[PDB]
Design a protein around this ligand. Sequence first.
Ligand SMILES: CCCCCCCCCCCCCCCC(=O)OC[C@H](COP(=O)(O)OC[C@@H](O)CO)OC(=O)CCCCCCCCCCCCCCC
Ligand SMILES: CCCCCCCCCCCCCCCC(=O)OC[C@H](COP(=O)(O)OC[C@@H](O)CO)OC(=O)CCCCCCCCCCCCCCC
Ligand SMILES: CCCCCCCCCCCCCCCC(=O)OC[C@H](COP(=O)(O)OC[C@@H](O)CO)OC(=O)CCCCCCCCCCCCCCC
Ligand SMILES: CCCCCCCCCCCCCCCC(=O)OC[C@H](COP(=O)(O)OC[C@@H](O)CO)OC(=O)CCCCCCCCCCCCCCC
Ligand SMILES: CCCCCCCCCCCCCCCC(=O)OC[C@H](COP(=O)(O)OC[C@@H](O)CO)OC(=O)CCCCCCCCCCCCCCC
Ligand SMILES: CCCCCCCCCCCCCCCC(=O)OC[C@H](COP(=O)(O)OC[C@@H](O)CO)OC(=O)CCCCCCCCCCCCCCC
Ligand SMILES: CCCCCCCCCCCCCCCC(=O)OC[C@H](COP(=O)(O)OC[C@@H](O)CO)OC(=O)CCCCCCCCCCCCCCC
Ligand SMILES: CCCCCCCCCCCCCCCC(=O)OC[C@H](COP(=O)(O)OC[C@@H](O)CO)OC(=O)CCCCCCCCCCCCCCC
Ligand SMILES: CCCCCCCCCCCCCCCC(=O)OC[C@H](COP(=O)(O)OC[C@@H](O)CO)OC(=O)CCCCCCCCCCCCCCC
Ligand SMILES: CCCCCCCCCCCCCCCC(=O)OC[C@H](COP(=O)(O)OC[C@@H](O)CO)OC(=O)CCCCCCCCCCCCCCC
Ligand SMILES: CCCCCCCCCCCCCCCC(=O)OC[C@H](COP(=O)(O)OC[C@@H](O)CO)OC(=O)CCCCCCCCCCCCCCC
Ligand SMILES: CCCCCCCCCCCCCCCC(=O)OC[C@H](COP(=O)(O)OC[C@@H](O)CO)OC(=O)CCCCCCCCCCCCCCC
Ligand SMILES: CCCCCCCCCCCCCCCC(=O)OC[C@H](COP(=O)(O)OC[C@@H](O)CO)OC(=O)CCCCCCCCCCCCCCC
Lengths: 63, 63, 63, 63, 63, 63, 63, 63, 63, 63, 63, 63, 63, 63, 63, 63, 63, 63, 63
Amino acid sequence: DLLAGGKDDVKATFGADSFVMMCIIIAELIVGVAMYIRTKNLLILLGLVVVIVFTTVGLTFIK
Amino acid sequence: DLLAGGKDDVKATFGADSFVMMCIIIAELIVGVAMYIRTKNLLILLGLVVVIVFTTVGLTFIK
Amino acid sequence: DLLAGGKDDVKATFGADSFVMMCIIIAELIVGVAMYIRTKNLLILLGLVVVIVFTTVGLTFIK
Amino acid sequence: DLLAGGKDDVKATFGADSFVMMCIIIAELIVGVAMYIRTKNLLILLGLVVVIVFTTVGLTFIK
Amino acid sequence: DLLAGGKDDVKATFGADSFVMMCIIIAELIVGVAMYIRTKNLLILLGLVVVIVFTTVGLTFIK
Amino acid sequence: DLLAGGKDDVKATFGADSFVMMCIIIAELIVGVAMYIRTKNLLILLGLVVVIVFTTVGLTFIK
Amino acid sequence: DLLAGGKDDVKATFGADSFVMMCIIIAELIVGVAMYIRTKNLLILLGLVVVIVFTTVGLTFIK
Amino acid sequence: DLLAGGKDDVKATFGADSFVMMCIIIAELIVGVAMYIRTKNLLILLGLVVVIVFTTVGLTFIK
Amino acid sequence: DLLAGGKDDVKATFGADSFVMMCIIIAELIVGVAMYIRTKNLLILLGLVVVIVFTTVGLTFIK
Amino acid sequence: DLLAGGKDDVKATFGADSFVMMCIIIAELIVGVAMYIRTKNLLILLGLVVVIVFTTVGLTFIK
Amino acid sequence: DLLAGGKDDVKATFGADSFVMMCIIIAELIVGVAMYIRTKNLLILLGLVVVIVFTTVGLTFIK
Amino acid sequence: DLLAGGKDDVKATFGADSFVMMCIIIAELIVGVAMYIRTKNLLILLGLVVVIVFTTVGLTFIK
Amino acid sequence: DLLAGGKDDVKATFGADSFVMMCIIIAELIVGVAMYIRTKNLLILLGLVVVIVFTTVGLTFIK
Amino acid sequence: DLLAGGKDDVKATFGADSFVMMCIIIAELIVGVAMYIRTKNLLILLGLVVVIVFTTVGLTFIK
Amino acid sequence: DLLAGGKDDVKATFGADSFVMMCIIIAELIVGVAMYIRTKNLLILLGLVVVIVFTTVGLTFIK
Amino acid sequence: DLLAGGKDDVKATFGADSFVMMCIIIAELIVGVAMYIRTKNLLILLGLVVVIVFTTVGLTFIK
Amino acid sequence: DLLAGGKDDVKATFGADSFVMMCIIIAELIVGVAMYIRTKNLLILLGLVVVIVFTTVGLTFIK
Amino acid sequence: DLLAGGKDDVKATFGADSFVMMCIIIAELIVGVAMYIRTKNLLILLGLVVVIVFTTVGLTFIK
Amino acid sequence: DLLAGGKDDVKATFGADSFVMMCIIIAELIVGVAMYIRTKNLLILLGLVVVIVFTTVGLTFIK
Ligand SMILES: CCCCCCCCCCCCCCCC(=O)OC[C@H](COP(=O)(O)OC[C@@H](O)CO)OC(=O)CCCCCCCCCCCCCCC
Ligand SMILES: CCCCCCCCCCCCCCCC(=O)OC[C@H](COP(=O)(O)OC[C@@H](O)CO)OC(=O)CCCCCCCCCCCCCCC
Ligand SMILES: CCCCCCCCCCCCCCCC(=O)OC[C@H](COP(=O)(O)OC[C@@H](O)CO)OC(=O)CCCCCCCCCCCCCCC
Ligand SMILES: CCCCCCCCCCCCCCCC(=O)OC[C@H](COP(=O)(O)OC[C@@H](O)CO)OC(=O)CCCCCCCCCCCCCCC
Ligand SMILES: CCCCCCCCCCCCCCCC(=O)OC[C@H](COP(=O)(O)OC[C@@H](O)CO)OC(=O)CCCCCCCCCCCCCCC
Ligand SMILES: CCCCCCCCCCCCCCCC(=O)OC[C@H](COP(=O)(O)OC[C@@H](O)CO)OC(=O)CCCCCCCCCCCCCCC
Ligand SMILES: CCCCCCCCCCCCCCCC(=O)OC[C@H](COP(=O)(O)OC[C@@H](O)CO)OC(=O)CCCCCCCCCCCCCCC
Ligand SMILES: CCCCCCCCCCCCCCCC(=O)OC[C@H](COP(=O)(O)OC[C@@H](O)CO)OC(=O)CCCCCCCCCCCCCCC
Ligand SMILES: CCCCCCCCCCCCCCCC(=O)OC[C@H](COP(=O)(O)OC[C@@H](O)CO)OC(=O)CCCCCCCCCCCCCCC
Ligand SMILES: CCCCCCCCCCCCCCCC(=O)OC[C@H](COP(=O)(O)OC[C@@H](O)CO)OC(=O)CCCCCCCCCCCCCCC
Ligand SMILES: CCCCCCCCCCCCCCCC(=O)OC[C@H](COP(=O)(O)OC[C@@H](O)CO)OC(=O)CCCCCCCCCCCCCCC
Ligand SMILES: CCCCCCCCCCCCCCCC(=O)OC[C@H](COP(=O)(O)OC[C@@H](O)CO)OC(=O)CCCCCCCCCCCCCCC
Ligand SMILES: CCCCCCCCCCCCCCCC(=O)OC[C@H](COP(=O)(O)OC[C@@H](O)CO)OC(=O)CCCCCCCCCCCCCCC
């Protein structure tokens, strides 16, 4: 059988609605605008979108 | 014959559905996004994929 | 003649299908991914392959 | 003349095919992989080769 | 039967609400900010989170 | 029951209004401006903000 | 209660009218003109303004 | 004579049709397209060709 | 006269057609392609050639 | 006069054509290529040359 | 007068052309190359020179 | 009651105006300039300030 | 009272007109020009000025 | 009084007419022309002038 | 007095008629024509003149 | 007199017609063409000429 | 008077025409060309000149 | 009065013109050039000058 | 009263002008230069100064 195996709730800690998933997404926003202002090209504002989908489709592979 | 040879269930502890295999994959996600935001190039988001397959095809060599 | 010479089954303990050969290979996997995530270069995932062959071709020299 | 001089079979005990020569070579393998995993440089896997030849060409000097 | 087996209250000493669990968590905070200021990268502020969960899910394995 | 468990006032020593919390925040200011002047990019002045919130929301997890 | 808690006058040492706040502002001026002369663009002369306000509104968060 | 000399099948492990020769060629493809898209010049798509021939004419020097 | 002087066959172990000379050349190939893909400049593929000649003209100095 | 003075043949043991002079030169070759592959700069392949001359002109000072 | 005073030939035993002066110089050579190969910096090959002169100018102080 | 308790004048020996407090502050100056010249960054000249205040506010906790 | 307290003349040794204060200032000059020539930017020639004032206003805090 | 205080002639060693002041000025000339030829802009030939005055007005602060 | 002060002949080595002053002037000629041919504007041929006078009037400041 | 002084033939090893002088010149050729092709400017093909003369006029200073 | 004072001929060993002064100058040549080829800038070929004069004017200070 | 007080000639042994003062200065030269060649920056050749003056002005403090 | 109390002249033996105070200061010089040459940083040459003052101000506390 499995040991240490536990709980999982660790998943709920890092999961969909979380504190860490909430700060990791807000940093993408705030330094996304930063690296935009210093440059002014737009692929970087789109760089926020790839974090939205990545975390979303990423978290479903945890199970 | 073999000694110490045991159980194996140690395999079930580190195996496919596990606690340690669940945290080792979630760290790839969370520091994958990190090293992405500080840079914004995409091979690193793909760095999560190589952990998916590596652990998958790796665990089958244990036997 | 030989003394102490025994059994060998000690070979079966450390041999091909074993408990110690099973844990020594699983550590290569789990710290292989570790040193990968902290860096993200791939020669290290290949570092698992050299343990596969080394133990394999190594054990045949015991005899 | 010689005294205590004996048998030799002591040579057969520590000689080519032996129990002690079998364990002294298997330790080189198992701690060779160890010090490899903790580091990942390859001269150490080659450290097994120098034990192969050393014991081989060493035992022939006993006579 | 068991000897020395006691009390446990030792568990209550090192357990959830404790003095030692209170200082071991506050050191993570104060040297977390330290190693942040000297560097200014953020995975380290997240290093406090992994101590929160580790002690939490760790203490439940004592029993 | 608990032992060593004490006082807490240790919390009041490292808590919200404190001497150590007062110096750890003032160092962020003074080396924040330093690493700004030597570079002149602004995410670093914002590096003071993340220490404000981190200590604030951090101290509430002590209990 | 609080320990070590002291004096504060440490605040008066690093505070509004101070020696260190006087040198940290004068360095912004002298290397501000430097990086201006070697380049001749003006956002950098404005880089002195952001140090004026930052220290000003920063020091009020110490309390 | 030769010692340790073995098998070779190690050659078959890293040889023409292999697992490692299969992944080392597929990485050239996937990061070849990457460094192409970020730039859009074509010598890099040709960079896949030089890996085809190099491994091919390289493996024949092993013997 | 000479002592310990032996055999040589140690030379045949590390000599022209060998196991160790076979692996030391195959590593040049596999990490040669690696450091090529991560960069894509060609002097490194030529780095395999200098190992071919070096071992070749090197082994003849052993005698 | 001299005592213990002997033979010399010890010189023939460590001298020009020897077993130890044969292994000490072959290690320079095999770890020379090693530290080359991990780096790929060439002063190290030249590091074999300085062992050739050093042992050569060194042994003549023994007398 | 002097007693025990002897012979000297002890000087001839440890003197210029000797057995012990011959082995003490040959060890400098063989472990000089050793500590060179493991490192590859050259002050150590020069470490043989300082033994040449030291023994030479040292032995003349015996009288 | 207290024993050994003494005098204090030991405090006057290590106190505000002292010989040891005079040398411990002058070393900060002289190796402060040293580590500055070898580098030329200025947080280190400020390293003298933190010794001024530390000893000052430190000595008042002795009582 | 104070012990060990002495003389001070140690102050006169490291003080304003001294031998050590004379060499510590002359090194700033000679390696100031060095790091200038290898680069040719001028903030470094100004690096001599900050040593002039630092030692000057530093020595007055000794008392 | 002062100790170690000496001579000064150290000043005459590094002073106006000296050997080190003669080589430190001649290097400015020879690498001044170098960095000129590789570029061909003239502020760098003027870089020799700032070494003339700097050493001149610098040496007078030694006293 | 002065130490290390020597000879000067170092001046004669880098002086008016020298080997290094002869090569530093000939490089100005040969890369002067180069950067001319690739462009064909004439201020660059005049760039040789400024090296003639600079070294000439430069060398007289050595004394 | 001189010690260790030897032979010279070390000079003949690194001298005019040599193995090392033959490889050090051939590397200039092969990486000279390399850095030419990746760029296509010609001062670099001339970079081979400066190695011809440098080794030539350099070797004559050995004596 | 002086003791140990000897001979000097140690000076003749390391002096003007010597074996060690002959190898220390030839290394400057061979790694001078090396660091030139890998870069192709010329101040480094001039790096041989500063070893010529340094040893020359250095050896005269031994007396 | 004084005992053991002797001679001094020990001073003449380690003094100005000596054997040990002659070797301690020649090592500065030979490893000065070494650490120069491996790097090629010049403050290190100047490192010989600071040994000249240090021993000179140092020996005068012995009395 | 006092016994054993003597002479003092023991003070004159270890005092200001002495044999032991003369050798203890000369060792600081000779191993000061040693640890300098092996490193080449200058706080260590200053390590001689702290022995000058320490013995000086130390000896006055004997009385
Ligand atoms: C788990 C699945 C992982 C799959 C990840 C796929 C990555 C493959 C890389 C493709 C080529 C790399 C292009 C380099 C990047 C490149 O050349 O552009 C560079 C661009 C940012 O520009 P830079 O500031 O780096 O400056 C470079 C510019 O000069 C070039 O325009 O990258 C971005 O961050 C913009 C993103 C927009 C592009 C959106 C693409 C769609 C992405 C979707 C994948 C979502 C992941 C979900 C997974 C959970
Ligand atoms: C057990 C089997 C082990 C086989 C492992 C194969 C490794 C061979 C190495 C090939 C060349 C190395 C390239 C260096 C890496 C390199 O140059 O890219 C660098 C890139 C990350 O970029 P960095 O942040 O390091 O910055 C470098 C950039 O400037 C270059 O674009 O590496 C990644 O992590 C991205 C991965 C995408 C590439 C996917 C390749 C497909 C992999 C599949 C293997 C799965 C393993 C399964 C095993 C269980
Ligand atoms: C019993 C037989 C023993 C033979 C062992 C052969 C070892 C000879 C060493 C060759 C050169 C050393 C290279 C240094 C290593 C080096 O430079 O790369 C370094 C690399 C890991 O990279 P690091 O994290 O150390 O960082 C260094 C990087 O910056 C360099 O890319 O080493 C690995 O672990 C990757 C392995 C892939 C390479 C595969 C080679 C094929 C191996 C096959 C041998 C199997 C053994 C079977 C025996 C049972
Ligand atoms: C009891 C269960 C134990 C399971 C523990 C799982 C550990 C497996 C290791 C995975 C890969 C290692 C990554 C190296 C670390 C690495 O590469 O990053 C390095 C990073 C800190 O950065 P450094 O200052 O070390 O500098 C390195 C940087 O340059 C790299 O960005 O590590 C941290 O402390 C940040 C943590 C954020 C990452 C969060 C991951 C989620 C963790 C959850 C596990 C909670 C434990 C609960 C147990 C009670
Ligand atoms: C405590 C509160 C902290 C809040 C800090 C806010 C920072 C958020 C960053 C915004 C975008 C980053 C822009 C990058 C910077 C950027 O792209 O410009 C770059 C510019 C200097 O130019 P560089 O020499 O770096 O060269 C880049 C140029 O090519 C671009 O023009 O930055 C400056 O130092 C000029 C400052 C003028 C801009 C004034 C903005 C107003 C600031 C007010 C905040 C005062 C702080 C008070 C706190 C006490
Ligand atoms: C074992 C045999 C080894 C021989 C290897 C030969 C290498 C000699 C180097 C020649 C000059 C170097 C050019 C620098 C490279 C250079 O300047 O181009 C640069 C180019 C990639 O461009 P980058 O992204 O580096 O950007 C630079 C650009 O601005 C220049 O266009 O290199 C490539 O990867 C493209 C390859 C196409 C060129 C194909 C050539 C044919 C190759 C055939 C050899 C096959 C090897 C088989 C061996 C098994
Ligand atoms: C036993 C005999 C030993 C002789 C060895 C000779 C070494 C002398 C060094 C010459 C200058 C050093 C150049 C630095 C290297 C340098 O600057 O290039 C650097 C280059 C690799 O480039 P990296 O990745 O290091 O990046 C640097 C690049 O930006 C420069 O293009 O080195 C290589 O591995 C390519 C090799 C092609 C060059 C082939 C030369 C011919 C070699 C033949 C010798 C065979 C040895 C046989 C002995 C058994
Ligand atoms: C018995 C006589 C002893 C004389 C020995 C002479 C040693 C004097 C040291 C000179 C300067 C030291 C240079 C540091 C070394 C240095 O800076 O290079 C470093 C280089 C290896 O590079 P590393 O891997 O250490 O990395 C450093 C690199 O970044 C620098 O390129 O050293 C080598 O092993 C290459 C050897 C080629 C150089 C050949 C020189 C000719 C030698 C001939 C002497 C033969 C001895 C015969 C005696 C029997
Ligand atoms: C002890 C007193 C110290 C006072 C030092 C004063 C330094 C203050 C810095 C002012 C602005 C910095 C300009 C950056 C430098 C800059 O932007 O120019 C850059 C220029 C060299 O050009 P680069 O090769 O660095 O390339 C940058 C170019 O693209 C810009 O044209 O600097 C020089 O070396 C030329 C010097 C001519 C300028 C002469 C100025 C007068 C100097 C007089 C001071 C004598 C010192 C005597 C003290 C003993
Ligand atoms: C020791 C005394 C040092 C004094 C040095 C004086 C430098 C002051 C700089 C003046 C303005 C800079 C002009 C930038 C340069 C500039 O704008 O022109 C640029 C020009 C070369 O053109 P480029 O290839 O750089 O392309 C830029 C073109 O598009 C502009 O036409 O510079 C040259 O090398 C030509 C020199 C002819 C000009 C001769 C002037 C007379 C010089 C005499 C000084 C002799 C020194 C003797 C000292 C020993
Ligand atoms: C032992 C004697 C040592 C004397 C060495 C003399 C070096 C003095 C440096 C002069 C100015 C430096 C120019 C920087 C170099 C520079 O600006 O050009 C750069 C050029 C190569 O161009 P890069 O690829 O570095 O790119 C820079 C380009 O954009 C500039 O065109 O250098 C070369 O390798 C070409 C060599 C042709 C020039 C030939 C000159 C004649 C040389 C003769 C000396 C022979 C030595 C014999 C000694 C044994
Ligand atoms: C015993 C007397 C000691 C006096 C030594 C004098 C050293 C003073 C340092 C001056 C400024 C330092 C410059 C840094 C060096 C620097 O910035 O250039 C760097 C240059 C080599 O370039 P790197 O490869 O380090 O790369 C840096 C480049 O990007 C800069 O061009 O240094 C050299 O080895 C070239 C030497 C030519 C320069 C010749 C100068 C004349 C020297 C004469 C002294 C002979 C000594 C005889 C004593 C026996
Ligand atoms: C008895 C009197 C003792 C007084 C000693 C004075 C020491 C005070 C230290 C000043 C600042 C330390 C600088 C660190 C050193 C530093 O930052 O430079 C580092 C430099 C060598 O460079 P490294 O190889 O250590 O690499 C570091 C480099 O990256 C920095 O350029 O040190 C040297 O050996 C060069 C010496 C030239 C400088 C000459 C200064 C004048 C000295 C005169 C004193 C003579 C002593 C006579 C006494 C008998």
